[PDB]
Amino acid sequence: SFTPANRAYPYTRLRRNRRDDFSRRLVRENVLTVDDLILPVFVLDGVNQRESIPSMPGVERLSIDQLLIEAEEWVALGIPALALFPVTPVEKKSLDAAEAYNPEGIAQRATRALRERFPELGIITDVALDPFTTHGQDGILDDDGYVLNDVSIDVLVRQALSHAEAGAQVVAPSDMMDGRIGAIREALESAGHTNVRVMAYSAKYASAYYGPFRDAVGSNKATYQMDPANSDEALHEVAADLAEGADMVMVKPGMPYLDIVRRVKDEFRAPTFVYQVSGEYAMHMGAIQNGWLAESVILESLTAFKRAGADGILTYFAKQAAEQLRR
Amino acid sequence: FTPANRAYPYTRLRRNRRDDFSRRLVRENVLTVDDLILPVFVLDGVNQRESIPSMPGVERLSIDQLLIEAEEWVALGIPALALFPVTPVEKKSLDAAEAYNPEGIAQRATRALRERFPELGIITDVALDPFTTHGQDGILDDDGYVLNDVSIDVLVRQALSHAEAGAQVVAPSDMMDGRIGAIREALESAGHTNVRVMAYSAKYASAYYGPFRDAVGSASNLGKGNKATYQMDPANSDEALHEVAADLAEGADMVMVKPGMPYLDIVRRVKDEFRAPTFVYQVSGEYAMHMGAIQNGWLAESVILESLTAFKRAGADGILTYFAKQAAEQLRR
Amino acid sequence: SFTPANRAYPYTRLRRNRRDDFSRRLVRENVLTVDDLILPVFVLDGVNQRESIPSMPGVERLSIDQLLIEAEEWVALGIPALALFPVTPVEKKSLDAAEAYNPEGIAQRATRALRERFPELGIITDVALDPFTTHGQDGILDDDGYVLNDVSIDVLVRQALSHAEAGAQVVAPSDMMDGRIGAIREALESAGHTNVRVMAYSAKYASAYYGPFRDAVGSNKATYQMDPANSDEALHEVAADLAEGADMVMVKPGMPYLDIVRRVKDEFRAPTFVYQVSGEYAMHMGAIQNGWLAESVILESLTAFKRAGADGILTYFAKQAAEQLRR
Amino acid sequence: FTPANRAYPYTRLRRNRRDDFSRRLVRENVLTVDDLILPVFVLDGVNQRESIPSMPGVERLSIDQLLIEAEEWVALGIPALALFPVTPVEKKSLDAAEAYNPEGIAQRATRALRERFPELGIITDVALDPFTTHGQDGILDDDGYVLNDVSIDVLVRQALSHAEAGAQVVAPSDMMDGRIGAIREALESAGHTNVRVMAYSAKYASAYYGPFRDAVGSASNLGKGNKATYQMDPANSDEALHEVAADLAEGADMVMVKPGMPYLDIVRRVKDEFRAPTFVYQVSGEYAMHMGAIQNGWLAESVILESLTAFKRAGADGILTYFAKQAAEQLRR
Amino acid sequence: SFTPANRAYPYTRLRRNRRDDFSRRLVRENVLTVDDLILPVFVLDGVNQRESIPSMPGVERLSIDQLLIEAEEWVALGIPALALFPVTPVEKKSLDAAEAYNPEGIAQRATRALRERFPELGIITDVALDPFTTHGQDGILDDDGYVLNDVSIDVLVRQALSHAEAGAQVVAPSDMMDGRIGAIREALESAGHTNVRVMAYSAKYASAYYGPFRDAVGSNKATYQMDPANSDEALHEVAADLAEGADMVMVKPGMPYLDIVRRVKDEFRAPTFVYQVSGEYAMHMGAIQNGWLAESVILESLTAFKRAGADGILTYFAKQAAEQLRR
Amino acid sequence: FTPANRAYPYTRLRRNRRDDFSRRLVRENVLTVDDLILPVFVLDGVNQRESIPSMPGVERLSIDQLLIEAEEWVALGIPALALFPVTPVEKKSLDAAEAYNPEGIAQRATRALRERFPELGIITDVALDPFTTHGQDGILDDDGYVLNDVSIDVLVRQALSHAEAGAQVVAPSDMMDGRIGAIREALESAGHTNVRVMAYSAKYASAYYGPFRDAVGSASNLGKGNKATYQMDPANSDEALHEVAADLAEGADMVMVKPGMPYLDIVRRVKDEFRAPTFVYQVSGEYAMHMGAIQNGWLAESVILESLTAFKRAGADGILTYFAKQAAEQLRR
Ligand SMILES: [Mg+2]
Ligand SMILES: [Mg+2]
Ligand SMILES: [Mg+2]
Ligand SMILES: [Mg+2]
Ligand SMILES: [Mg+2]
Ligand SMILES: [Mg+2]
């Protein structure tokens, strides 16, 4: 609700509160903290290795030993959680995506290593088949190349269970199959994984902003990911995921969809997350490196998510932002 | 909103996504050329064209060159331009008098375009930052503070000079309190009954303006200066509603949120609460970010229409965008 | 929500935005596009045949070969979908409406032909028994002449399945039996027709505006179709149809019910369709032909549906409108 | 709204539909004669009756004939008439002075009806289009634009002349900004304390007015002219709320949406947001469309009461309709 | 929603519309019609008999033959429905309330007689045990004198079925047992009484206004009927009854609860009824007979129900009101 | 509202009803003596007590008798009285001058009660109907119409005379447009800063006032007359919101709905929309109806507290009720 309350110039001058830092601080509506940050990480198969990514300047693919080294500092900075994205070797991709539930798959190995070394650090695993398929699509294809909904869910369920067994505190289904949150929740409950959180990618759009990620991980989408034009539809997606048992719901991409974040928080009043995707990172970082924009745009972009209603932000800027906030 | 007890598998939201025809039927928003406003940087002199390193693909244009390029903008159906003069260094002063010079770049450009393309909307910029030695949007007191009401007096003279030049829309971008009402009162008294006022209502103290300050040549003047005593704190959303309410009460015909994509939640709230003509500026930093990534091959050119569609979905009636020509071309196909 | 925001003349003059075409275009709230149009078509049994309809000037009943010819152009104009209405031969009408689920019935034959020749064109079939009954009522009658609800649903389910088997992407139950959307959805799901859309005629009124259609197809209603007086009741109809699995919901007739379209979109935020019925078409076309109204009323009438909240419009003017929009 | 977990088969919405008695009990809206206003076209002279080809069944009537026909309108219980003079060609001018002639058709007709039928509501039309050579609703400037405030001055004189003639309601149909407040101020100053103002608040730039322009004889004058600079864009709904809010603030006793059936969503929003006396005009084109189809045998005469019921359901308190006599007759039975 | 829209005297004078009858008629927000009236009738066991009721001046208990005579006129006046209340002979009252489901009970006999003679007249039977118990309470008592909820429902279900078998179009459970609407609906559906309406007495208050009725029929309540103090509680009652299948919901008593009628209509937008109870009738009629109030208060009281949001009114003034409306 | 998926048998609403203690815990509203205002009919002269046949148990009282009875009203904790003078026939006139007589019954009674019981609230009636020969609430023009603004002038003089007499609250019951603002302006100008105005905001043209008109002696004067040109149409609910909004804008400290029980929906809407101090009059006809039935043995005396509880539940902050003494007695026990 809102009421202008008959405020009128010059009795009301909105610049008065802007006059001094102390009053700007007092009326400041939102603040970003390190409690808000989730760091996505690209994880390699090998040992004592890192790789640079052409379209994601400054971001590295890390072997697990290197991931453990970097995590010490992420923990010291107070970053609450990581989101793991394995970089699957080619030999291990298949039509059936079986590597998704391999107990010795990269995601599973990385999860065990991190849970043991940093017990308080949140590990959010990715429940998705596209890192494991030869076609790079987010599911099992029928003979006509369509991603089969329910058949794909069966594999996602096995994958989610394997992550829970590896000790992940949160599994995050990013697949956009209908009904997958309920299927995964039912499976977790029956297997006794009472407290494993499900972070649903609820309103995930078919987007050009995912380009750099596809490079990072080494990977039509319009038949499952959402049309960028659609806002009301996002409410139905979130409503279903909450009914199906999600503990958190997410909007993807991020800044191009801040209106969706706002509507979702306003309507459901549930823990709401947003992904500042690879293309958003790359655009900002490229402009900063070129000297076109100041470093301050990073915190401005992240503050936007808070103002828009996000409880947490998956962002490749997490470390940089945490360092800035710590000072 | 009411979920209406929709549940999988009776409800599968992928069904409408299955085919292009059903995606088209349920598509909630569509960008058209009706939605686009093209900002243009205008140089003094004749036969001048200058590239802007921090805005790849954008040029500053002398009036003769502007008139030539506008032929294609008009052919593409772009409804309006927003003019930004590149003020010569020597014409900057403490008093910002060049703002209301009937022979200033903005005024000259307006008269030329109104004559040549009578149906094309011309939106002039009401602001003092192109004209001040310090790069601030108003007149400074002895403590270095941007004076509110004294600045309004100059903005009023500027707006009147634009109306006299034939501008159909004046757009105060200054963020002084109460300037919309002062400008409206002045336009009414002077008989400029139908000159629209496009208020920059919720304009934030942003870092995304860097490339624009280069383009217009205010960057050198501003130096490390900031605008936190007048432009809004990025953290604040409720405050934007109070800004818009005042500007509507004061007579604005349109209200604007600036920057754009980093403030889509503000666009949404403003449209939802006021149900008034709502505009959004996809600013220079947004343009530069996208361009840089496209030219690097990091993002497909399809991101341009995705970014612009977002504004429509968020509630904008129109978008000031440096991509206007490209977008119009892509929409025409 | 709304807030006048203390706007007052002469500070606020609403004519300023109206002063010039460019500003009218900038503030224009709604636009009709070809994405919004669905063309209903009356389909004959024979070959190389068309028939004119006295009460629907300009509209033709088409044999399937003629339908295929005209569809080439409808596709070229970008019309996304057709709604098929078979003109059932007399010999084939019965009390049990068995022709409804005949795999060689007109609707089924037309569907197969169109799906093969124009794979991207949406085909919306009509799930209804009134084209197939000897009494022309929308269901199976009991001994007292009442349309039996559940018994009629059993036939509608068989019909819907036959349309799915013929390849229809959308089935549209126009019958106004209670609970039929759920029964049809359950049947489609169990038979593996996962992606067949159901476009529910949710709030379909007992109306005098259907007269010309009844002539077109060669066909008391108050015991199932809605009382024109009732608005709140339409919300209950739509709520049930959404709970029962409808992918789209429709209001019928159209322009005499624009307030219903508005309420339905506002309350449910779901894909909402509206039928500009035969009587609406006939009124407009008659007035245009008589020289009483300009052709421009067509686009004005269709723009109304968009403004009122419709996502799509079933309209006999679809081709004319698409041609106007293309220029 | 709350669905309250209603589900088939426990909820079968056909149960209330099963019998006439239960349909009658749950029926949400009912049209009565309290709801009907009859527009009438008034000729100069004596013993004149003229048929209008594009409005079958409607006649232009001289005042003597009007008085005779009004006997039955009153007997049927129709609460009010809306008068539309058919101005002689020679009395049209640039200055629209005939609008405020105390001996103009509207004024004469008002005095005659107020004397003969003291309880019958008379709603006069405040607009300049019957009186201008160009057929526009106001006075034109040298650029062909309908001047806002100069036109208001004439409309004020017209409204005062109607009040002097005894009209209980004046209905400004002109769509000039601010005219409701100007007319109200003038009525108050002159002591016309109780003269109602029925604002045409959300009146659209429609194609459904064709037959009316024939009936009143403004068609020849307007030619191919349009009213897009004052009448509303059919695409716009939010804008209608701003129009109504201003007219209520300015003192309107009733507010109207025009045309009718193509704008039922606007009627609904206006009633919902303002909870004020809300009227709707079922315009000449709506009447003609229906009549044409009825006379062709394409639609049953029951469509008349269906069309009018729609207005009640949508939120209208009253309906200006050329079907008023027919409807009143059908309701009396 | 509401918005004052800055209306201010003297620009706004609300008396202008009040100045003349014609403008009062145009802006009049609500009208009572005969479509709104339901007439309760007290039915005797005998033949060729009527009885006067001391506390309900002008109201008569009628034998069935007399009821048929009076109904001819009620039908001629256009009253859509009657609500039957049998006056049970003493010999037939019992602890088990078995007379409630006797196929030859007064209510059942009256229903058959009326359905045969006036097929279009709505008959609403009373589903309640208090006309049949020796203690006059609304159910089966346990050993401590408490009205047992579920046990009482079992009897109410048998009663409702007996009314459906007698041909009643509407059964109206007036008992205020929890969950009885659902139990009755389930029973009607299973027995094939698809179209029998259930008019739930949803928010029925423990009231002093029922005194005269108790005399009419010849009959603690706070453990089932609602506390007069409670408004929010009425919303929960109605929500349950709608979920349980009620076709109409009712508020009882009437005029002392118009705020409840308003809230119920506003929140549920469902067919909403109100009972102007015996004490309301008696108060008004007594004052009229004493010459303290004019007859016009009858229509004023009934107009109140319409304005408050009622779709129909059970009122002992139905005939008088219908006569006034007819003139 | 949100049903929260409550379903039988997990939800049984009889559980809270099972025992007195849980009924008491969940009870949503409670009537107290804080809620009661007692209207009293005041006679001229000394030692006068008169019974009113159409209001059993109510007496008209001379000021000396009023002072005696008020001792018990005060002891019972009744916060305020509403005074209604029974004007002698000879003091009625066209000009209603007795309304502002400093020696009128209302004024005399106010001074006496303010002196004797300094803490007792005195609410005077601002209205001309006790003082006019015709029984209408204002001054009549030559057509028999109750003039709005001319009547306000007299009401203002009356209200000032009440403030001078010491009334803490003046209650304009007249239903003239704009009278609240006129009275407030006058009170402010005269220094009556803290005199409350209890507006009769939504007062209906009701038939439930009959016994009151007997009690005050206006019945003979009014005869068959009506008040439909100023009191509200019983059919209208939205209109009541506009009445209240104006009275709040005009400065009312409290707003009232009248009659009471037949208008509980209006009380509810008014409280819900304005969240202001909201009062309701349980009028003479409501009192008479209840009394008649109680004395006949048709209703138990418990109906009195049931009727009054309804007002609290519906949203009233206070109730003007002829049952105030009985209710206070029953609440004290
Ligand atoms: Mg989903
Ligand atoms: Mg501002
Ligand atoms: Mg249905
Ligand atoms: Mg206007
Ligand atoms: Mg209950
Ligand atoms: Mg008032």
Q: Which value, to the nearest 10 degrees, does the dihedral of the CA atoms of residues B251, B253, B259, B265 take?
A: 90
Looking at domain F1-333, its CATH architecture is Alpha-Beta Barrel (3.20)
Tokens linked to D188: 């108050």
Secondary structure class of B245 (helix, strand, coil): helix
Tokens coding E24:
């009062």
Alpha carbon F84 to chain centroid, angstroms: 10
Neighbours of D156 (CB within 10 A): 21
- Cα→Cα distances B95→B153, B160, B170, C173, Å: 11, 17, 21, 72
Residue C208 has which token pair? 């005098």
- Please, which residues bridge with residue D116 across strands? none
Maximum Cα interatomic distance, chain E, rounded to a whole number of Å: 72
Q: Are B35 and B317 within 8 A, CB to CB?
A: yes
Task: Give the residue numbers of E annotated as catalytic, written as ranges.
Answer: 204, 252
In chain D, helix, strand, coil percent, each to 5?
A: 45, 20, 40
Inter-residue contact B299 to B274 (CB < 8 Å): no
Structure tokens at C206: 């007992």
Which helix (H) or strand (E) covers residue A294, if one does? none
Give the sign of the dihedral formed by CA C58, CA C61, CA C63, CA C65: positive
Per DSSP, which regions of chain B are E strands?
A: 36-43, 49-51, 59-62, 80-85, 121-126, 169-172, 196-203, 254-258, 278-282, 318-321
Q: What token pair was written down for E17? A: 């519309």
Q: Contacts from D12-15 at CB under 8 Å and sequence distance 24+?
A: D12/C149, D12/C178, D12/C179, D12/E194, D12/E195, D13/C178, D13/C233, D13/C236, D13/C237, D13/C240, D14/C149, D14/C177, D14/C178, D14/C223, D14/C224, D14/E195, D15/E194, D15/E195, D15/E196, D15/E197, D15/E247
Q: Which residues contact E290 (CB under 8 A, 6 or more apart)?
A: F54, F292
Structure tokens given for A256: 């191009």
Give the integer Cα–Cα distance in Å for D285 and C288.
Answer: 10
Amino acid at B204: Y
Binding partners of E (≥3 Cβ pairs within 8 A): C, D, F
Among B120, B194, B275, beta carbon nearest to C22: B120
Residues of C in Cβ contact (< 8 Å) with D275: none
Residue with tokens 């640079």: A52
- Count the residues in chain D: 333
Does the distance separating the beta carbons of F273 and E230 come in below 8 Å?
A: no
- Which class does domain E1-327 fall in? alpha beta
Report the alpha-carbon distance of residue D53 to residue F116 in Å, rounded: 82
How many of the other CB atoms lie within 10 Å of CB of F297?
Answer: 10
Could B184 and C11 be called an inter-chain contact, meaning their C-beta atoms sit closer than 8 Å?
Answer: yes
- Output the six-digit token pair for D228: 């897009």
Residue at E35: amino acid letter: D
The answer to whether residues F220 and E8 touch, using CB atoms and an 8 Å cutoff, is no
Q: What does the angle CA E211 – CA E214 – CA E220 come to, to the nearest 5 degrees?
A: 80
Query: Phi and psi dihedrals of E312, rounded to 5?
Result: -160, 155
Cβ within 8 Å, pair D2-F7: no
What are B39's strand-pairing partners? B82
Q: Which residues of D touch B (CB under 8 A)?
A: 1-3, 5, 7, 148-149, 238, 241-242
Contact of B39 with C322, CB cutoff 8 Å: no
Q: Is A145 exposed, middle or buried (0-12, 13-18, 19+ CB in 10 A)?
A: exposed
| Rounded Cα–Cα distance for residues F71 and C193 (Å) | 84
Ligand whose nearest atom lies closest to the CA of F152:
6
Name the residue among D11, D194, D273 with its Cβ closest to that of E3: D273
Q: Give Cα separations from C286 to A262, C256, C282, D300 (angstroms).
A: 49, 18, 6, 15
- In the three-class reduction of DSSP (H, G, I as helix; E, B as strand; rest coil), residue B50 is classed as strand
On whether the CB atoms of residues E212 and E56 are closer than 8 A, the answer is yes
CA pair distance B84, B212, nearest whole angstrom:
10
Rounded-to-integer distance, Cα B144 and Cα B229, Å: 11
Query: Which helix H or strand E contains E268, and what residues bound it?
Result: helix E258-268
Helix, strand, coil % in chain E, rounded to nearest 5: 45, 15, 35
Helix (H), strand (E) at residue E234: helix E232-243
Across A169-322, the runs of DSSP E, i.e. the strands, are 170-173, 197-204, 248-252, 272-276, 312-315
Helix/strand/coil for F272: helix
Q: Determine the Cα–Cα distance for residues E13 and E17; give it in Å rounded to an integer.
A: 8
Q: Show the tokens assigned to A33.
A: 């903290």
Residue B253 to residues B82, B277, D151, F49: CA-CA distances in angstroms? 16, 7, 22, 69
Nearest CA to CA, how far is F238 from chain D (Å)? 6
- Whether residue A92 lies in the annotated active site: no
- In which element (H, E) is residue F74 found? helix F63-75
Residues 6+ apart with CB under 8 A from E86: E42, E43, E105, E106, E107, E110, E126, E131, E217
Parallel, antiparallel, or unpaired for β F49-51 and F59-62?
Answer: antiparallel
On the 0-12 / 13-18 / 19+ scale of CB atoms within 10 A, D117 is: middle
> What are the residues facing F61 on neighbouring strands?
F42, F49
How far from the centroid of its chain's Cα atoms is residue D161's Cα? 20
Instruction: Give me the residue label for tokens 């889509």.
Output: B264
Helix (H) or strand (E) holding E40: strand E37-43
Instruction: Specify the length of chain F in residues.
Output: 333
* Helix, strand, coil abundance in chain B, percent, nearest 5: 45, 20, 40
CA torsion, ordered D111, D116, D121, D123, to nearest 10 deg: -30
Q: What is the 3-state secondary structure (H, E, C) of chain C?
A: CCCCCCCCCCCCCCHHHHCCHHHHHHHCCCCCCHHHEEEEEEECCCCCCEEECCCCCCCEEECHHHHHHHHHHHHHHCCCEEEEEECCCHHHCECCCHHHHCCCCHHHHHHHHHHHHCCCCEEEEEECCCCCECCCCCCCECCCCCECHHHHHHHHHHHHHHHHHHCCCEEEECCCCCCHHHHHHHHHHHCCCCCCEEEEEEEEECCHHHHHHHHHHCCCHHHCCECCCCCHHHHHHHHHHHHCCCCEEEEECCHHHHHHHHHHHHHHCCCEEEEECHHHHHHHHHHHHCCCCCCCHHHHHHHHHHHHCCCEEEECCHHHHHHHHHC
> Do residues D76 and D37 touch, judged by C-beta distance below 8 A?
no
Mutate one of B2, B8, B15 to test the C interface: name it (highest C CB count within 10 A). Answer: B15
Taking a C-beta distance cutoff of 8 angstroms, is the pair F90, F82 a contact? no
**CB-based contact A28 B268, cutoff 8 Å:** no
Q: With touching defined as 3+ CB pairs under 8 A, do chains D and A touch?
A: no
The answer to whether E55 and E209 have CB atoms below 8 angstroms apart is no
Asked if A136 and A219 count as a contact pair (C-beta separation under 8 A), the reply is yes
The first and second tokens of residue D58, run together, are 């409607």
| Chain B residue nearest residue D239, CA to CA | B276
Q: CA–CA separation, B323 vs B318, rounded Å?
A: 13
Secondary structure (3-state) at F321 = strand
Looking at the complex, report in whole angstroms how far the Cα of residue C269 sits from the nearest Cα belonging to chain A. Answer: 6
- Neighbour-count burial of D169, counting CB atoms closer than 10 A to its CB (0-12 exposed, 13-18 middle, 19+ buried): buried
Active site residue C252: yes
Helices E232-243, E180-190: crossing angle, 10 deg rounding:
10
3-state secondary structure E108-174: HHHHHHHHHHCCCCEEEEEECCCCCECCCCCCCECCCCCECHHHHHHHHHHHHHHHHHHCCCEEEEC
State the Rg of chain A over Cα.
Answer: 21
Q: Is the C-alpha dihedral spanning A79, A85, A86, A87 positive or negative?
A: negative
Burial bucket for residue B119 (CB in 10 Å: 0-12, 13-18, 19+): exposed
Length reported for chain A: 327
Q: Which two tokens stand for residue D265?
A: 């969503």
Select from F198, F93, F195 the least CA-distant residue to F154: F93
**What 3-state class would DSSP assign to B189?**
helix
- Contact in structure between C202 and C243 (CB atoms under 8 Å): no
Residues in chain B: 333
> Quick one: DSSP state of residue E46?
S
Q: To the nearest 10°, report the CA torsion of B175, B178, B181, B184.
A: -40
Q: Which of F49, F28, F47, F39 is nearest to F78 (CA)?
A: F39
Give contacts of C149 with chain E, Cβ < 8 Å.
Answer: 194
Q: Label residues E1-24 b or e (16+ Cβ within 10 Å = b).
A: ebbbbbbbbebbbbbbbbbbebbb
Q: Which two tokens stand for residue C133?
A: 């009954």
Name A90's Cβ contacts closer than 8 Å, sequence gap at least 6: none
C85 residue type, one letter: F
What resolution in Å is listed for this PDB structure?
1.5
> Across the strands, what pairs with A42?
A61, A85
From the CB coordinates, do chains D and F have 3 or more pairs under 8 Å? yes
**Cα distance between residue C84 and residue C92, in whole Å:** 18
Q: Would you tell me how many other CB atoms lie within 10 Å of the CB of residue A81? A: 18
C-alpha distances out from residue B29 to A253, B18, C322, D69, D208, Å: 18, 19, 19, 52, 28
Cα(A262)–Cα(A322) distance, integer angstroms? 24
Helix (H) or strand (E) holding E251: strand E248-252
Distances (CA, A) of A264 to A203, E140, F1: 9, 50, 20
DSSP per-residue codes, F139-160? -B-TTS-B-HHHHHHHHHHHHH
CA distance A182 to B258: 41
What 8-state DSSP symbol labels residue A293? S
Q: Which of D72, D94, D96, D76 is nearest to D85 (CA)?
A: D96
- Residue F168: how many other CB atoms lie within 10 Å: 17
| CB-CB contact of B48 with B67 (8 Å) | no
What is the number of other CB atoms lying within 10 angstroms of the CB of residue F81? 27
DSSP 3-state of D181:
helix
**b/e code B27-65 from CB counts within 10 Å (16+ = b):** bbbbbebbbbbbbbbbbeeeebeeebebbbebbbbbbeb
Rounded to whole angstroms, the Cα distance separating C137 from E115 reads: 26
Rounded distance between C-alpha atoms, residue B214 and residue B98, angstroms? 20
**E295 among the known binding-site residues?**
no
- Angle among Cα A105, A109, A111 to the nearest 5 degrees reads 120
Query: Quick one: which H or E segment has residue F123?
Result: strand F121-126
F322 marked among binding-site residues: yes
Contact B201, B255 (CB under 8 A): yes
Q: For residues F131 and F88, is the Cβ–Cβ distance under 8 A?
A: no
Question: In which region does residue F5 sit, left (phi positive, over 0), alpha (psi from -120 to 50) or beta (all else)?
Answer: left
Q: d(Cα D272, Cα C171) in Å, to the nearest integer?
A: 35
Q: Are the beta carbons of C174 and C199 closer than 8 angstroms?
A: no
- Measured CA angle at A159 (ends A157, A160), to 5 deg: 65
What is the gyration radius of the CA atoms in chain D, in angstroms? Answer: 20
- The partner residue sitting opposite E307, judged by closest CB among F206, F265, F298, is F265
Based on its alpha-carbon atoms, the radius of gyration of chain E, rounded to whole angstroms, reads 21
Is the bond leading into B172 cis (omega within 30 degrees of zero)?
no
